[model samples]
Target: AFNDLLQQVGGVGRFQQIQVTLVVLPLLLMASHNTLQNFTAAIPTHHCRPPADAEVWLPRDRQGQPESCLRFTSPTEPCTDGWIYDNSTFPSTIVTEWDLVCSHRALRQLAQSLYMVGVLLGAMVFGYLADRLGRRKVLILNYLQTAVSGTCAAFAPNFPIYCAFRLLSGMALAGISLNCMTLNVEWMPIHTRACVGTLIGYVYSLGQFLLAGVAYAVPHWRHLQLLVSAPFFAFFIYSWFFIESARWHSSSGRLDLTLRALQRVARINGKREEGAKLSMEVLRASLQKEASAMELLRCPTLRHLFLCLSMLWFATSFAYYGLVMDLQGFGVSIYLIQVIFGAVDLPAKLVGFLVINSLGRRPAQMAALLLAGICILLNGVIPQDQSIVRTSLAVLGKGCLAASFNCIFLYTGELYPTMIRQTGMGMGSTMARVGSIVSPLVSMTAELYPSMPLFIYGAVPVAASAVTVLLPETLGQPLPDTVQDLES
Candidate 1:
C-alpha cells in the first residue's frame, strides 16, 4: 500500500536511510517561516499602531495634583480635559501614545485584507497550474515566488508598497500550502495519510515559534523577512533531485516515461523487473478522460464534495483567523503568548495524528471543533486576571483549531479523485481564502464592542460543528471521486 521513496528509486535496502535532520527536518522551518509570516507581517500595520479615535483624559484634584496613571479612550469619544476633585489627590487619564496607536486602525485592517486578496487569486492560478503541469514543478515555482515576494515586501518603500508586495506574497503563499498538501499526501501511503498529513500540520505551529526565535534574534521586520526568504532559495537547488509523481505521470498518459523511471528505481535497488510493461492504450484513456475544474464542479459527487468541504473551510478560516487577529485583547506578553500558543500546537497535532484513524475522521474532526468551542466559551467565562487559567484555556482552544485546520486538508485530499483533486481543492481552499479576508473584518468589527469577538468566535464554531456531521466518514475509505460515492 505504501510506495517507499527509497524503493521507488530502486535503492531500498541498498542504501540505509541516513539520519538527515537539517535537510529534511528543516523543511518544517521553511514551511513554518512562511506560516509565521502570516502573523508577523501584519504587526507593522496592526500591533505597532494606535487604536482609532482614541482620546487622552487628564485628572485634577482639589489640591491641583497632576495625573499619575493613564488609560485609553473609547473609539467614539474625544479627550475631555477636566480634573474632577472627588476627594482623590490624583485622577487617571488617557495617554497620548495610546491615541496614536488607535488612529492607524484602518491601515492595520488593510494589511490583512490585501493579503487575502492575494491569496484568493494566487490559489486558483496555482491550483490550475499544478494540475495542468505537475505538483513538483508548481511547488518549485511557488517557493521562488514566495521568497522574492517576501523579500520585496520586507523593504517596501511605503505602507502601500509594502501592502502590494504582501499581496504578491499572499498569492505565492496561498499556492504553497495547497500544493504542498497535494505533494506530501500524494507521496504518503493511504493508511498513513491522516497521520502523515497532521505531522505536516506542525509546520504552521512551528512557524509561530520559528518567527518568535527570528524576531527575538533579529528584532526588525526587514531582517526577519530576509531570514525567512533566504533559505527557500535553497529549494531551487534541490529541484532536479526530486522526481515528478509517477501516479500523475501515469494518469497523464506518460507511461513510457513512468516505466523508465520505475526501471531506474528497480536498477538502483539492484533488482531486475523486465516483466513490468506499460499499456499505452489504458494510459491514453486515463489521460483523455482527465477531469477539469469545471468538470469536477459539474459532477454530482464533486459538487456535494465541494459544498461539504467549502462549508467547513469557511467556518474554520473565520474562527482561526478571527481568534489570531483578536489575540491582542489578552494583554499578555506577545512573545510569551506566541511561544506558548506555538508550543500547544505540537501536542495537538501529535494527538490528532495518533488518533485520526483510531478515532476515525468524522469523530476526530467533530471532537476538535467541539473542543475549540468549549475553549472559547471557557475563555469568556474566565477572567483575564486569572492569567494562568486564561492562558491554559486559550492554548487548548488554539490547539484544537490548529489540529482541525490540518485535518481539513488531509480529509479533502482523500475525498477527491486524482484527476480533479487539485482543482477541487484549489476552489475549496480559495473559498477558505475568502473566509480569511472576512476573518479580519469580523475581528475589527468585534473590536468596536468589547468582548464581542470572543463571544462570536466561541459561538460561531459551535454552529459550524454541525457541518462536520454533513461530511461522510473517510477513515480507511478509498478517496471518493464522485458525488454518488459520498451521498450513497
Candidate 2:
C-alpha cells in the first residue's frame, strides 16, 4: 500500500531512491539539435551553392599562348529570361566549372572550422566553470549565449558575420551536452540511469522533426534560422524554474546547499525536517578523502580504462559526426536528406532504451557498434544509382550507430566514482571534441579524395570495438565509490 501511494505521487519523497526508467528526463539536448544546422547546411551554402554560379573567363595571351580562367559567383546574376529565376538554374554540373559551388563551399567550410575552433576553446573554459560553480549556473549561461548567437546568425548581413556568429554558437554549444547528461544521471536513481540516458536522444529526434516541419513550411534560409532561434528564448526562460542538482552539490562538498535543495523537494512533496539537524561538516570531510585525477591515472587498471574510454569517445564522435556531415557526398538534396537522417535516429534511440536494460550494457553496445561499422563499410560497395538499397542501408547503419553512441553516455558515467565522476566525463568528452574538430577536415579531404573518410569511419569503430571488449562491464553494479572499487 505504501509503494502504491508512492507510485501515485509519481515517486515523490521516496528517499530509498527514484527510478528514472519511466520518468521524463529533460536533457539540454536541444542545443545540439538547434546547432545541427552548423554542419548539414555547410555542404550546400558553401559547397554546392557557390559552384552553381561558377564563371569561366577566356583571355588571349600576347605570345600566342592560350590563357583561360574560371570565376565562380552566385546565380544572383540578373538573367535575360524568366527561366534564369528558376531554383534549378543552379544545378551541380554547371556550378562546379565556374567555381560557384566552390566559393560557397569555401565560406561554409571556413565557418564550420571557426565554429569548431570556438568549441574547443569553449569546452575547456565551460567545463572548468561547470565543475567549479554548478550545473544550473553553467547551463543557464550556455542557453543564453547559444540562443543569442543563433539569433545573430539568422540576421548576419554577410558571410563573415555569419561565420563569426557560428563560431560563437559553437563555443556556447560545447559543455551543455556533457553537463546536461551528467546532470540527468546525477538526479536519477541507479537502476534507471541507462534508460534515462538513452532516451535523451529523443530530444534531438524531436528537434529534427520540428526542423523538418519548419523547413518544409519555410524553405528560405534566413526565415528558418529565425523560426528556430525564437523558441530557444522560451527555453532559456524555462531554465530559471528548474532546481539545481542536489546530487552534484553533495558530491562537490556543498552539503549544506544539497540538503537545502533536498529539503525544498521534500517540502514540495510534503515531508519536512529540521535543517539544523543535518550537518555538512562530515560530508565535506568525506569529499576531502576522495581520489584526485592524478591518483586515478596512477592505477594501472584505471589508466587502461581511461585510454580505452578516450578511444571510444574519439571513435564514436568521429564516425557518427563524419558520416552525418558527409551525407551530401552521396549526391542527394541535402535539406531533404537531413530530414530523413534526423527521423532515422528516433527508433534506434527507442530500441536502445529497451535493450540496454534487459540485454545488459556490454552485449547491446558491442552488437550496435559492430553492426554500425559493417553498414558504413557497405556504403563504399553500393552504387549511387541503387538509391532505394543505398538509402535503406544508410538508415540502418545510422540507427545502429545512434544506439551505440547512446550506450556510451551511460557507460562512461557508471565507470567512475562520485568524487571524480564529473572529472572523468569532462576528460573523455574533451577528447571527443578533438574528434569533432577534425571531422570537417576529414569531410573536406573526402571531397578531395572520394571514399577516404567513409572507409576511415567504418574501420576505426571496428578497431575501437576490439578495445571495448577489454573494458569492465557495469550493467547492474552499484555506482563505484572509489578508484579501488572501479579497479576491482
Each prediction's TM-score versus the true structure: 0.72, 0.73
Give the poorly placed runs of model 2, Cα more than 4 Å off: 1-100, 103-106, 182-195, 242-267, 270-290, 296-298, 329-336, 349-363, 417-420, 472-488
How would you encode candidate 2's per-residue C-alpha lDDT over 34-113 as one tens digit per residue? 34543335323221112332323223345633222322222223222111112442222222222334334444545566
Deviation from truth (RMSD, Å), model 2: 7.6
Model 1, position 163, has a per-residue lDDT of 76
Q: What is the Å distance of residue 448 in model 1 from its true position?
A: 2.4
Where does model 1 exceed 4 Å of error?
1-100, 185-196, 254-256, 263-308, 329-331, 350-363, 381-383, 406-424, 467-488
lDDT value, residue 429 of candidate 1? 64
Instruction: In model 2, state the lDDT of residue 335.
Output: 55
| CA-lDDT, candidates in order | 0.63, 0.63
lDDT of 1: 0.63
